[model samples]
Every structure is written in structure tokens, then in C-alpha cells.
Target: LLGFKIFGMPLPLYAFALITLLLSHFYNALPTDIVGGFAIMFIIGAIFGEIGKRLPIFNKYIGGAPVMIFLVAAYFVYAGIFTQKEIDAISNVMDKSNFLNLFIAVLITGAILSVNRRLLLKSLLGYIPTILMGIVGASIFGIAIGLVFGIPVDRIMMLYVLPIMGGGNGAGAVPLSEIYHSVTGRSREEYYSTAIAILTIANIFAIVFAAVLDIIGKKHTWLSGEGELVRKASFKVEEDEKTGQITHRETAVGLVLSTTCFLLAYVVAKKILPSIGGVAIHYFAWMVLIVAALNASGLCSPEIKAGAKRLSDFFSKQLLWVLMVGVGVCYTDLQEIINAITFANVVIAAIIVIGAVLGAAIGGWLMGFFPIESAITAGLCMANRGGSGDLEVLSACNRMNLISYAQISSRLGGGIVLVIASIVFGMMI
Candidate 1:
């Protein structure tokens, strides 16, 4: 949309060397780096991810690839197929190689850079209110049930609920823990596991809500969009671009520009975040703003817009299972999840998550967004783990097209929560 359209450019085979070189860098650094050691991981993850993607049960009601692979990884870990040492090896490579970091940089930067300028030019007007209302609604609803269950309202609101709503893990829990930890002298050791439990449990509710919400939308015509966020004529993708194709140079421009954007965000956040406050500013959030503002300006090169989308889609599709295996290793602790499995606790998770969903829907209805669409994106996506959550939430809602709004909620929506959390911290502590 900015300057050109280089569509359908898959990573070239020479790019295979790009992957090889990158993989080798870590190997050279950590000779124990599992290039040979990971055959078990690589082979099983791929097989399970492939199988999970196709299971009839997935399409029927349960969530798809992300959920499936995550569960399998959890079982494998808990079952002791891979030792803690093995998982640690995988996590180290993910961190040091910064493949995880690189993945976020490439995906977000590339996606935003590749967009048609017009779509961004006129995004929704009441998105901020929708997100705010979603947050408000969730708290009202979640707090009500939590107290009834004899869980202290402050503990539930301060600990479980706020952290779940704050953002994804990186933006969400780490800061929430610090906030909570600062209030108490305890190390993160005590609360971190609980925070992880809420993330896991809340994510499950988000995905299932989407699945059931699809059915609800079907039966009640008033509750339908089947996942669409924008109905107006302006936001639609150009029909010609859909039917046509483009060059590598134009398509791949985002590849370089996005990385540059990430580096720039890091620099900007380093300078700006320090002055902002005690709360750690998420540079990923800053990165989103910088990229979006540039994209919407209509002056930055089109490659910036196109490249982000191309690269994001390319990697997200290829690496979902692989990356999620890492998520299982690093992020999830099935024992904690299982430990939270009291009939009472499960019901409370329900109340809080549904509270968030209905809170979004209710706030959205007041703010002039379609209720179901708002719930799916601002509400459900808000409750899930960022963009990865966006895919499954929208998919189950049958509104894959609303991916853009889902992004806005987690990126901008996460920013909104961070700001609010900081303010609430100011008030509470």
C-alpha cells in the first residue's frame, strides 16, 4: 500500500542457507546445542504438530494447532520424555539465538509494513473505549464471583485477574509479578507459578469461548459476525491485489525494514522508557506504535507495510508448532495447571474469563461496536496470549478476517492495560 506490492514471495531456497547459518550460530556458541541432540524433539514435535493440525476433533469443537501442540508438549514434559536439562537446552537456544526475539521482530514489523495504506488510514474510532470497557467489564464480573467463592477480592483482582488481563506473558506476568512482588518481600518463586496458571487457564477459556460463541452466533442472529470486525466498505482488501501477484524486492522490503524498526524501537524505548516511570515500558508496544504510525503516515515505503505481513505470515505458519513446543517448555507448568483444577477453582476461572468476554461485549455494545465482534477481539483476544491467541480466537469465532482488530487489541490493548495497571498500582500500593 505504501509504494509497492510484492506478493507471494516465499523464502527462497538460498534462504534455506539463511536458516542454516542462523541455526549454526547458536551451535557454534553452545556446542552442546542439540543440532544433533534435538532429533527427538524435532521429529516428535513435527509429527504431533502435523497430526494435531488435522485431527477431526479439532474442527469439531476443541481448538486447533496451537492448543493441540501445546497439550502434547505438556504431556511430554510432564511424562518425563524430555528431562529438564533438555528443555533448558531448547530454551537457551531460543533466547540466545534470539530466534524467539527475531521471530516477534520479523513477524510484527513485516506484517505492518506490508499492509494496504487505506486499511490502516481508517481503523475503528472507538477501539480504545471498547478495550477499556472490556477491561472494566472483566473486573466487575470476575471480582463478583471470586468473592463469592471466599477468595479475597484483593488477591483475585490483584493477582490472578489483573495479570491475566494485563497482556500476554512477557508484557503481562513479568511486570505483574514485579508489581505484586514489590508489595511483598517474597521472591518471584512463590507467585510466578500461580501467574502461569492463570495464563494457561485463561487461554483455555478464550479458545473455548470462541468455539461456543461461534455456535451462539449461529443460533442467535443478533450475536453474529461470525468473527468480522469491520463491515464498512473502506477497510476491505483490494480485490485486484487478491487476484494478482508481485516481485521479491517489493515483497521482501519489509524483511529488512522491520528488523530496522525493531532495533529502532529498542533504541527509542531505552531513551524514553526510563523517563516514563517505575513500570517497565514494553518496547514491543513501542515497536508497534512506531511501525503503525509509519505505516499509516502513507509516506514510509510500501515494503515496510508489505514485508511485515509477508514475513509474519511466512514464519507464523511455518514455526507455530516449533515455537509452541518452546512455549510448553518455558511457559507452561502442567502441574500448576492441574493443581488449580478444583471444581471451585475451575468455576472461578470461568467467571473471570467470561466476565472479560461479556465485559468486552457489553462495553462494545455501549461503544457502538458489534457485540460479538468486540467480544472476540477486544474481549477474547485480550484474554488470550497476544497474536497467537488472536489466530485461534478468530478462527473459532469463524472470523479469521478480523485478524487486524485482534492485533490492535493485544498490541494497543496490551498498552492500555499496562497504563491502567500502573495507575491501579499507584492507587492500590
Candidate 2:
């Protein structure tokens, strides 16, 4: 029962764990490259992730391991437990080396391709409205909360609601800052600093809400499809009729297919058509489209599709915690979060998240979706940071199968917010 491993190395108990950690630290020989980056994350992520799952109240209420892993990692960074070099190394792997993109790209390809073509098309049609409803809920709740604090409606919409629902940091807050700068003639840094702080608070709320929603779904089973977003729609990944089992060669093909699709998305979104009719399209959105098109085309063999699901399973199951470590160390800024911890910010952020969940729940129900699944995907995913936030929320909810829908919220839904910000800024700010 106690037998365990770290990165596939036999680590049976306290001795192996201690020796590995002590020896690595005593020598001070952990490199700052990919190898060292992966080592530190996996080591730390595995330990904390395990602890989180077993801690009674936390496991039951809070976002179990994913929340625990990232927050602990963030605390380490905040408390100066991790060196700047170590932080930089993890950040390099997560961002510079494009690991996050790879993770999302693979998930999108495999998950979307695995869906039934008919359900896929039907779900996509309703998903956009559900996302929009979340935005509307966020706006209404944010405004009401802001009014209680005597903050104006315009500021609430621009500063809090937009940033929280805009996607995440890069695709959401950063671009919103640019828009604010261009429109209000304010420093981008000024807008970004406040926007990021508020967004951070909302991210925490979103994760907690994900866990809460999961619990509620379990108690009220009819509200959830367990992982299926659409009501009464089958969530099974179509298995390969021709292939007996997942082969190494097939897994490699999965890798190639996902990466190639990512490249195509990059070319199309970046070079060929950055926007359609003035609305910008993030590469992730394009990747979803490209992969979904491939799936619907019926050109990919059943074996090939199965290979993609196999690859996605490996990443989402095995490497997710490792990614969580990076997200904590790299994305989370505990200091900033603390500084932003005024009563108003916390209350407003929580209210907006609540609003988003309710909005999605209502909207999705009308569209024949499970309330819990819709709220988790359309609501919480939009409220959190883009890809990483999507992972955390889904992980907390134990609904990683809904990743494709979450991506639509982060990428396509985010793009919609950007366009709205542009128009709203023009009208108000």
C-alpha cells in the first residue's frame, strides 16, 4: 500500500524521499535547464499533491492536490524558500520553452478528436452563449459589489469584471491593459498591476468554487453529467475499432499530430488571420478549430484518434501535478495577493465568481447542458487564468475530460471579452 515512486524511480518511504532531497540540496548541483526544472517540480509537486489529497477538510472542500500543490509552491516563492534561479528555471520551462502551450495543444487535440462528431457540433453552438452569460453575470455582480464600496460602475466593469473574465494573464489582463492605455492614456503598468491583483483573487475564488461545485454535483447528481457538458449526451471517447491496443508507434503519431496542428494554428492565427472581422483569434482557439475540423472530417483513422486520446491521458494524468508546481512557482504571486486582500476586493471577486456560476448554470440549462458541468467549464474557466487556470479548475472538479469546452471559454470567450472591452472602453472610459 505504501509503495510509491517519483518520476518512475522507486521511492518506498521516508528514507528514499529524504536521501533524494538531501543529496540534491547538499551538492547544490540541480541545473537550471530543462532537466533540473522537471526534477524540482516533480519532486515538490508529488510530495505536496499527496499531502493535499489526504488532508480531510482540504481534500473534501478545497481543490485537493492541484490547489495544494500550487499554493505551497507559491508560498515557497513568496517566502524565499526557492532561489531566484530555480524560479526562473521553472518559468522558462513553463513559458519560454512553451510547455504550457504543448500541454493545452495536446489536450485540445486529443479531447476534441475523441468526442462524437454530432455532439461536438451541437455543444459548440451552445457554448458561446453560455460563456457570454457568465460574462454578463460577472458584470452584474461586480457592479453591485462595487456600488456597495462606492466604486463606480464603469470602474467595476473595466477594472474587475473585464480582468477576471478576460481569460487569464497574457491573453486577458495584458491585452486589456493595452486597450486601457490606448483609450484612457494611463500607464499600462498601472492598469496591469491592479488588474493582475484582482484577477489573482478571482482565480483563487474560481478554484475554490470548482471544488464546491464538484461537491454539490455529487450530492445533487442530476445537475451534473459527471463530465459530460451536454445533458443526456454520451461522453465516451470513441475507441479505435481496428486497433487492439495503444501502441508506442501510435502514441508517437499522436504527438506528431498534435504538434503539427499547433503549428498550423500558430501560422493561421499569427500570420494568416490574426482576427476575423476585427475580433482577434488566439492560437489556442484556432487549434481547437483545426482539431475539431479534422475530427469532423472523418479523415483521421480510428487508430489515429485513439492514439491522440492515449497521449492526452498520459499528460493530464501523469504530468498535471508537475505543471501545477510550475504554475504555483511561476504564476502565483502570494505577496501580491496579500497586498490586494482588502475586504472589498475579496467580496467583489467572490460575488463575481458566484454570479458567473449562476449565469452559466441558468444559460446552460436552457441549452440542454448539465448545470454543474456548464458552470464549471463556462463559468469558472472564464473567471480564471487561461490555460493553467483551466487545468486547476478542471482538476479540482475532477472533470479534466471537459478540457475542450474549457479551452473555448479561455480562448474564444476571452477573445469576445477583448472585443467587448474595446467597445466598452470606447463608450465609457
Candidate 3:
């Protein structure tokens, strides 16, 4: 028999033996080693997470797991997977056509904004300001960092910006790789490998950092006032009621309508978007149309509504965790790190951080200018945390192929910074 030890305690002697046996029996296919490792890691992380929540030092240094993941992924690609020709090709394509990416980003952003206004307006938060600022600031900083460090701006953006802000690196990576190949005449595979690397790192950074920040912010009372205010503004007390099951007719109708609309919009967007402007327009238009129709037609059954919200929330959180770990697995080189650590790089990082803060602030404040929260939500929507919004933008830019690797990096980087800063600032003010 394999000796099972947990926390130095033999499993057979433990009071939870029955529970363990049940788990093992029911989930027999799961690898015991993996489960054990996960349990250990979870305990360790929980302990440290508590400490991080109380301390700002850990929050600042280790909070951004997605960023770390992306960086690691980039190194892995460079060392093990990518070739010089491939790298060069991606670079060339990115240099040649980045505008398409930006246009797509803007279009999707606009549509999200519109949908939020027409629908989910009551749940906006302090994080919106930070996200907006991060996007703009990171872009400007990327340029400066690139020029000064003698590194490509795109690389810097990928390294520094995307991780810190909430912008998921995966979304940015896909389009970036494509653009790099197009501009540099590089191999698509090489660009893909590189993108995977960066995206992984960004995701890791976001997860770790977000968690740390959440803890620190809670301890420091960062968003106490704003959180309270928003809470008050949106407060609605509901009595706990019995779980009311939906009728079969209602369920069937809701499912059918939802599926039809979603499919139709998706198909239409895919087919028609490239013809007009590119992928972004198609993505945004379709998403907006679908979301709008769903909301307006009341096709969101209680079950569907709950499921959608839960899925969105779960994905948003998981995106951060997966991004970080994935990115970490990709690193295998030191040169990239060395190249990224120059004075110019530092300045560019600062600039992006500052810009993100300012942009989000301005955007959030502007939303305050109107009675409705839609404008602020729009700004947040455009900030596009974690590249969730990238599909729409990339689709729109399909034809122009103008978006450069640098531009995509910058956009993502700026967005991430803005998210962090806005959250911090919102908590403070």
C-alpha cells in the first residue's frame, strides 16, 4: 500500500479518512499526486494570500501573475519554438499593419458601450476608471520604452503593460501574432508561439496581482467609500424566496430563442464583417445585436440569466489564473528579460502606468458628467480587460491588416495599467 501522508499526518489515522475514501472512490480517475499537489499549493497560497492582503509589498511585487506568465511564455517560444525567420516575419507584419487592430478594438468597445447603456447599467464599479487609463497610457509608454531600450515597442508593451492591467493577454496575443506574421513576413506558427508565450504571462500576472490587490485594497480600505456609495446607489433588498422552477413551456421557448439568436448573430457577423471593414466591426456589431435582442426580447430566462452572469464572472476570474500559469510555463530564456530592463523600459512602464491612471480617471469623471452610468461603463468596456474584447476588433481589422504588433501590445498594456490604477484610485478616493 502506498503511504498517504498529508501535512505529515498519515491518512489512515485522520478523522477525515471517510471523506478521503469517498473522494477517492468516486473520483478514482483523478491522479492522486495532482490532487495532493493542488491541496498543498492551495494551503500555501491561502496562507500567503492572507499575508499579502495585509501587506502592500507582496501585492505590488507578486500580484500580477498573468504578466509573469506571458513573459515566461514569450521566453519559451523564443528559446524552444520560434526561429529567427519566424520572429522577423511576425515583426514585419506587425509593423506593416496595426491600424486594423485598433479600429476593431474601438468598434467592439463602442458596441459594448451601447449594449451596457441599453441594458446592464446598474452595476458599474471603481475598476472602470483604472482600465481606461491603462490602455491609453500603456500605448504611449510602449513607444517611448521601445525607442529608449532599443527594443521593439510591441515587445515592451507585451512585457510590461498587458500583465498589470486586467487586459487578458490571450486575446491580445492572438491578434498580435497574426499581425506580426503579416507585417514581417514571418511564419504564422512562430508568431502564434510568441503570442501564446506573452498571453500566458499576462494572464498569470493578472491573476496573482488581482488577488493580492483585492486583499490589500480590502485591508487598506482603498475602495471603501466608493464601494459603499455604489452599494447604496444600487441597493435593493429582496426577501429570500423558495426556488421557483420555470415551467417546461417557458424553458423550451427561452432555450430555442436564445440559441437561434446567438447562432444567427454569430454566423452573420463572421460572414459579413470582413466585407465592410474587418473583424472588429463584425464582432462588435454581432455581439451588440445579439445582446441587445436578448435583453429587449426578455429571452434571458431566470436560469439563462443566472448562468450567463455566473459564467461571465467565473471566466473573468479564471482567465486571470490560467493566463498566469500558462505564461509561466513558456519562459526559457534570460536575454529577453535583460533586454526589457533598461532605463527607457522603466520610463515607458511609468508612462503607461500614469497614462492609464489619468485616462481612467478622466473617463470615469466624464461619466459622472452625465446622470447615467453608461458612459463610464462604456469607457470600461472599451478598456477591454483580458482581451475579451479583442475578437470583435480583430475581426474588423481583417481587411486592413494595419494593426502592428507594437500597437496591439500597447493597447493591451495600457488597458491593464488603467484597470489597476483605476481600482486603486477609486479605492483611495
- Name the top TM-score candidate: 1
lDDT of each: 0.66, 0.78, 0.38
TM-score versus the correct structure, for each prediction: 0.80, 0.79, 0.46
Name the best candidate (by lDDT). Answer: 2
- Could you give me the TM-score of model 3 versus the true structure? 0.46
* Candidate 3 C-alpha error for residue 132, in Å: 6.0
lDDT tens per residue, model 3, 242-354: 22354555434443443455456557756744333221322323544555455556534455444333333333333333323333333233554544445554454445444
lDDT of 2 by residue, 1-429 (tens): 456654455667545765676577667666778887887887888888888877977765555677789889989988887876678789888878978768767776777776656656766788778888888987888888899889899888878898998776646776687777776677876567678778878888898899888888889867788867766436455443464576888888989989999999889978999766545555665776788789889888777878888888788778888888987887666766677778888889899999999998999998878888889988788888756568778877889877767765676676678778877876785
Off by over 4 Å in 2: 1-14, 152-154, 166-200, 207-244, 277-279, 370-373, 384-429
In model 2, what is the error at residue 229, expressed in angstroms?
5.6
lDDT measured at residue 377 in model 3 versus the true structure, 0 to 100? 25
Q: Any runs in candidate 1 off by more than 4 Å, and if so which?
A: 1-31, 34-41, 55-62, 83-85, 110-118, 174-186, 230-246, 250-252, 277-280
Candidate 3 or 2, higher TM-score: 2
Residue 238 local lDDT, model 1: 49
